[PDB]
Amino acid sequence: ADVNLYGPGGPHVPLIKVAESFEKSQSKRVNITFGPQATWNDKAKKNADILFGASEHSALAIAEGHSERFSKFNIHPVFMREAIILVKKGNPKNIKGMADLLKPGIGIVVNDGAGVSNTSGTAVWEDSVGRMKNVEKLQAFRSNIHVFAPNSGSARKAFVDGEDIDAWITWVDWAIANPTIGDMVRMEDEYRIYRDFNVVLAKNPSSEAIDFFDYLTKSKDAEAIFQHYGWFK
Amino acid sequence: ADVNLYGPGGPHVPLIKVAESFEKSQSKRVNITFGPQATWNDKAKKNADILFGASEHSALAIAEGHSERFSKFNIHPVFMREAIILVKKGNPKNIKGMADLLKPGIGIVVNDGAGVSNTSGTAVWEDSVGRMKNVEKLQAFRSNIHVFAPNSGSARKAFVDGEDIDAWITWVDWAIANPTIGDMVRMEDEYRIYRDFNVVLAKNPSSEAIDFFDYLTKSKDAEAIFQHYGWFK
């Protein structure tokens, strides 16, 4: 490929469609490598043109591992989206928002990198629940957390395999890309958390990398593809 | 000491006063060790009774380093407080909230552990600014960030020493404990972020550790001391 992007699993779904749209219109090829950082970090050292991220803090931690080529000051927000509650198909417990997750008998999976994996969802649950301004509510929610998952795959597995798991706090774009796995319930306005999709272009970038970066970050075509998955500007 | 607590710098100010209050009323001695994890981690391995935290995600990452004695499922929220904007004494740029930090010429310090330090402030700024639901606002704020500091001391130093730094996104309890260093400006209701003070008691705890844990977590005396610094239940 002429342009190589690396980043976490999740945003690769619209990003690949953006790459495909770009490839239909001109001659350069664009490769999207995705998944947990550890699965591709050494390959990114060899040929990454752009690092993409699924939150600000996770992108910063990842980019710091590549500072020779990517500057933390050059991480560029492009789109954003809301966190959601993924519930089992049919919403059997009739969950209507974060307040319902405080009830007895509710089992929750959250994402937390735990200082060992750079994952986008770290601190989402505490920031949403903290806006309830009530420590007994924070205690109730936390006591219902069955799994603190370090990445997307482990959280998905805990949700799918766990009959006692009723909710996974994750991203709207994941739910839209995976509609057979669970249904989505929005967080209440007052407690909603939004994080971005970002990119950082390598120092001394190739003309091909610049072209793709411009298309992805500024095109209405790219915006429309990402909007399908709940992303917005 | 009969009871040893370890945790980040910051909450040690009220925590020590709670320890002192406890020591005035009974015979056991309580030691509070505080600062960045790396400064005390090996000592906590030898004699920690309780680990205290300054957010949920940072406490989880720290406790995971001591899983043999402390369970992530037993981290207990006790108090919470709001993030604030620390401005230079006299507020020379007349900053009134997060919206003002989007202006040209504003220099900002934020905390971000960057995957190398377990610090409480990681992801606060993105979660506050994200509630503005506008990616151009996220770009404007991010472009004004001069320093992504991995811990409290480095952020404080950047703020104090940097004539171009107008704001440090930090905690209300820090500002109240350090009133000669800067003045505090609240975030707007819509964008405010609140995180907790928590503790986890060791497995097979001593009677002395249990007693202090109960006093700290449930006493109105402890609540009043922490309330002085902006903490609430």
Name the features.
homodimer; 233 residues; alpha/beta; D-Maltodextrin-Binding Protein, domain 2; 9-stranded mixed β-sheet; 9 helices; 36% helix; elongated
Compact description:
Chain A is of the alpha/beta class and 233 residues long. Chain A has helices at 12-25, 37-47, 56-63, 124-130, 135-143, 152-161, 172-177, 207-218, 220-227; strands at residues 3-7, 30-34, 50-53, 76-87, 108-111, 145-149, 167-171, 183-186, 194-201.
Describe this structure as you would to a colleague.
The structure is a homodimer of 233-residue chains. Chain A has 233 residues and is α/β, with parallel strands linked by helices. Chain A has two domains: 1-81 and 196-233, 3-Layer(aba) Sandwich (D-Maltodextrin-Binding Protein, domain 2), CATH 3.40.190.10; 82-195, Periplasmic binding protein-like II (D-Maltodextrin-Binding Protein, domain 2, 3-Layer(aba) Sandwich), CATH 3.40.190. The first copy, chain A, is 36% helix and 22% strand. The first copy, chain A, has nine helices and nine strands. Chain A has helices at 12-25, 37-47, 56-63, 124-130, 135-143, 152-161, 172-177, 207-218, 220-227; strands at residues 3-7, 30-34, 50-53, 76-87, 108-111, 145-149, 167-171, 183-186, 194-201. In chain A, strands 1, 2, 3, 4, 5, 6, 7, 8 and 9 form a nine-stranded mixed beta sheet that branches. The longest helix of chain A is centred in the first third of the chain and has 14 residues, at 12-25. The two termini of chain A are 29 Å apart. Chain A binds chain B through residues 55-57, 60-62, 64-65, 72, 75-80, 112-116, 118, 122-127, 130-131, 133-136, 138-139, 142, 148, 192-196, 232-233, and chain B through 55-57, 60-62, 64-65, 72, 75-80, 112-116, 118, 122-127, 130-131, 133-136, 138-139, 142, 148, 192-196, 232-233. It is classed as cell invasion. The entry lists the keywords Accessory colonization factor AcfC, Virulence, Pathogenesis, csgid, Structural Genomics, niaid, National Institute of Allergy and Infectious Diseases, Center for Structural Genomics of Infectious Diseases, alpha/beta fold, Cellular processes, cell invasion. The assembly is dimeric. The entry is titled "1.42 Angstrom resolution crystal structure of accessory colonization factor AcfC (acfC) in complex with D-aspartic acid".
